[PDB]
Amino acid sequence: AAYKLVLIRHGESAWNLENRFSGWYDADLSPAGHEEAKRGGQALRDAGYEFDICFTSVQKRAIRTLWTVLDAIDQMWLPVVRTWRLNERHYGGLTGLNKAETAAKHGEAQVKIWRRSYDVPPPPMEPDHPFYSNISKDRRYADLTEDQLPSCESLKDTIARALPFWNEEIVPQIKEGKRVLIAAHGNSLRGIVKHLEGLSEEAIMELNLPTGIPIVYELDKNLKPIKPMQFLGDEET
Amino acid sequence: AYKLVLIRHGESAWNLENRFSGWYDADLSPAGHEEAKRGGQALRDAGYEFDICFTSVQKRAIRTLWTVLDAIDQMWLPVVRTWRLNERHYGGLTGLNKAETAAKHGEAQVKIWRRSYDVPPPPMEPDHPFYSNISKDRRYADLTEDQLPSCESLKDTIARALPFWNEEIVPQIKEGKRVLIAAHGNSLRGIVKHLEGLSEEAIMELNLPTGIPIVYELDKNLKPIKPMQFLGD
Numbered sequence: 001a002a003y004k005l006v007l008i009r010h011g012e013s014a015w016n017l018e019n020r021f022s023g024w025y026d027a028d029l030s031p032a033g034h035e036e037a038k039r040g041g042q043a044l045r046d047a048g049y050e051f052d053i054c055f056t057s058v059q060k061r062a063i064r065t066l067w068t069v070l071d072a073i074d075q076m077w078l079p080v081v082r083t084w085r086l087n088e089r090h091y092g093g094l095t096g097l098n099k100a101e102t103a104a105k106h107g108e109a110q111v112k113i114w115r116r117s118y119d120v121p122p123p124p125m126e127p128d129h130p131f132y133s134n135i136s137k138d139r140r141y142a143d144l145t146e147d148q149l150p151s152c153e154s155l156k157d158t159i160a161r162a163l164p165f166w167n168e169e170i171v172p173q174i175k176e177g178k179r180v181l182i183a184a185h186g187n188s189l190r191g192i193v194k195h196l197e198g199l200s201e202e203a204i205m206e207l208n209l210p211t212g213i214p215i216v217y218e219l220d221k222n223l224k225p226i227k228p229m230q231f232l233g234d235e236e237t
Numbered sequence: 238a239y240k241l242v243l244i245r246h247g248e249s250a251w252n253l254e255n256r257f258s259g260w261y262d263a264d265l266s267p268a269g270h271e272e273a274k275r276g277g278q279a280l281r282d283a284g285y286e287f288d289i290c291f292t293s294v295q296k297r298a299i300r301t302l303w304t305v306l307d308a309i310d311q312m313w314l315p316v317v318r319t320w321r322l323n324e325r326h327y328g329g330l331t332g333l334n335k336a337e338t339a340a341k342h343g344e345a346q347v348k349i350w351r352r353s354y355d356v357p358p359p360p361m362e363p364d365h366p367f368y369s370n371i372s373k374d375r376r377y378a379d380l381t382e383d384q385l386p387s388c389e390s391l392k393d394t395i396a397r398a399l400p401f402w403n404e405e406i407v408p409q410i411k412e413g414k415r416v417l418i419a420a421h422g423n424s425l426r427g428i429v430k431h432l433e434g435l436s437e438e439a440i441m442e443l444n445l446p447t448g449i450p451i452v453y454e455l456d457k458n459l460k461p462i463k464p465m466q467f468l469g470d
C-alpha cells in the first residue's frame with residue numbers, strides 16, 4: 001500500500017500494579033512494562049522497520065516506551081514530537097483511587113454506568129483532590145487554554161481532543177511520505193483507531209489494544225486501511 | 238538574566254573517545270552513562286527547570302540527554318536533534334588510536350593537525366571501515382553534497398555549528414525559554430567560542446569537562462555576565 005503506520009501502546013505502569021486510575025497522573029513504567037517495550041522494539045528490529053518521525057504524549061510511561069523502542073531499533077536520532085493531546089484519558093476524581101476505593105465510594109451501579117458509557121464522564125477532579133495540583137498545576141500544561149485543560153473526560157472527550165492532533169499534525173507527515181511511529185496510551189490510540197476504521201461507539205469501547213506489541217496499518221493514499229491491523233512479534237505473542 | 242546549561246557526554250564504548258570517535262555513532266560506556274546520571278543528579282539537586290532541549294544526532298549525546306531528563310523528571314520537554322551539533326568529523330583518523338595514527342601519518346603531521354585551527358585530517362575514503370557506515374547513513378540523506386563532511390578542521394566544525402545556534406537556539410533564549418544543550422566537545426567549543434569571543438588559540442586550549450552541567454548567565458545581548466560555572470560538589 002502507499003503508506004505504513006505503526007502504533008504501540010505502553011505496557012504495565014507502577015499504578016497498574018496498585019490497580020489505581022492513573023489517567024493524567026504521570027506514573028512510570030513498572031519493570032515488567034519496560035521489558036514489554038523492549039520486546040516490542042526487538043520485534044520491530046527483527047522485521048527491519050524504519051521510521052522517519054515519532055509522536056508521543058507528555059507522559060513518561062509512553063515516552064519511555066518510545067525511548068526503549070528507538071534504542072532497540074537503533075533509531076535514537078529520529079525527531080520526536082510530544083503532545084498532551086495523546087495523553088491517556090483523564091479520569092477526573094477517580095484519579096489515584098484503586099478498584100476497592102472506587103467501588104466503596106461510588107457503588108456498583110454508578111461504576112457500571114461509567115464503565116460502559118461513551119459520553120458520561122467520571123466526576124471532576126476538584127481543587128481539593130489529592131492530585132489536583134500535581135496534574136492541573138503541572139507546568140507542562142501551562143500553555144493550555146482554560147477549555148483545553150480537562151477536569152475529567154469521557155471516552156468521547158478523549159477522542160475529541162486527540163483527533164485534532166492526528167488531523168493537523170500527523171496526517172500531513174504521513175502524506176509527506178514520512179514513516180510514522182506513535183507511542184501512546186489505550187484511549188488516545190482508541191481515538192486514532194476509531195477514525196482509521198470508522199468504528200462505532202460500541203465497537204471502539206469493546207476494542208482492547210494489546211500492550212507492548214507493534215500494531216501495523218497498511219494505508220492507502222487517503223489513509224484508509226487496506227486490511228485489518230496486524231500485530232508484530234514471535235508466533236505465540 | 239537568561240540561564241543556559243550545556244553538558245558534554247562522557248566515555249563512549251571501546252575506548253572510542255581516545256580513538257577519534259568523530260561521526261562514528263558510538264554508544265556510551267556504562268561509565269559514561271553513570272557520568273550522565275551524576276550530572277542529572279546535580280541538576281535535580283539544584284532544582285533546575287528547562288523548557289527546550291537541543292542535542293546532536295549521535296546516540297552518545299542523545300542518551301546523555303535522556304539520562305539527564307530522567308534524573309530531573311522532565312522527560313516531557315521538547316527535544317530538537319541536529320547534525321550541526323555532531324562531534325568534529327575526524328576524517329580518515331576516525332577509529333584509530335594514537336599509536337596507529339602516528340604509525341600511519343608520522344609524528345610531525347599529527348602534531349600539525351593537533352595544533353592547527355584550519356587544517357583538516359585526511360578525508361574518510363571508501364577503504365575506511367566506517368565510510369559506508371557514516372556517509373550512507375539514512376540520518377544524513379537530506380544533507381547536500383557540500384554539507385556532508387569527509388573530514389573537518391576545528392574551523393569547519395564550528396562553522397557548521399554556529400548557523401544552528403543563531404537560527405534555532407538564540408531565538409528560544411530570547412523568548413525566555415530555558416535551554417539545555419547536550420552535545421560533544423568540539424561542537425560545544427563552537428558555542429563557547431561565540432559566547433565568550435575567544436581566540437582560535439584559546440578555544441583550542443579549552444577542554445570542557447564531561448558529564449558536568451555547565452551554567453552560563455547571559456544578558457539581553459546573550460553576552461555572559463560572569464565565567465561559566467560547574468554544578469556538583
Ligand SMILES: O=C(O)c1cc(-c2ccc(Cl)cc2)cc(NS(=O)(=O)c2ccc(-c3ccccc3)cc2)c1C(=O)O
Nearest residue numbers: 098099100101102103104105106107108109110111112
Ligand atoms: O460475589 C458477588 O455476588 C459479586 C459481587 C460483585 C460486586 C460486589 C460489590 C460491588 Cl461494590 C461491586 C460488585 C461483583 C461480582 N461479579 S461481576 O458482576 O462480574 C462485577 C465485578 C466487578 C465490578 C466492579 C465494580 C466497580 C469497581 C470495580 C469492579 C462489578 C461487577 C460478583 C459475583 O457474582 O461474583
Ligand SMILES: O=C(O)c1cc(-c2ccc(Cl)cc2)cc(NS(=O)(=O)c2ccc(-c3ccccc3)cc2)c1C(=O)O
Nearest residue numbers: 091094099100102103111112113114115116120121122
Ligand atoms: O477493563 C475495563 O474495561 C475496566 C474499565 C473500568 C472503568 C473505566 C472507566 C471508568 Cl470512568 C470507570 C471504570 C473499570 C474496570 N474495573 S471495575 O471498576 O472494578 C468494574 C468491573 C466490572 C464492571 C461491570 C460493568 C457492567 C456489567 C458488568 C460488570 C464495571 C466496572 C475495568 C476492568 O478492568 O474490568
Ligand SMILES: [Cl-]
Nearest residue numbers: 067080303316
Ligand atoms: Cl526524545
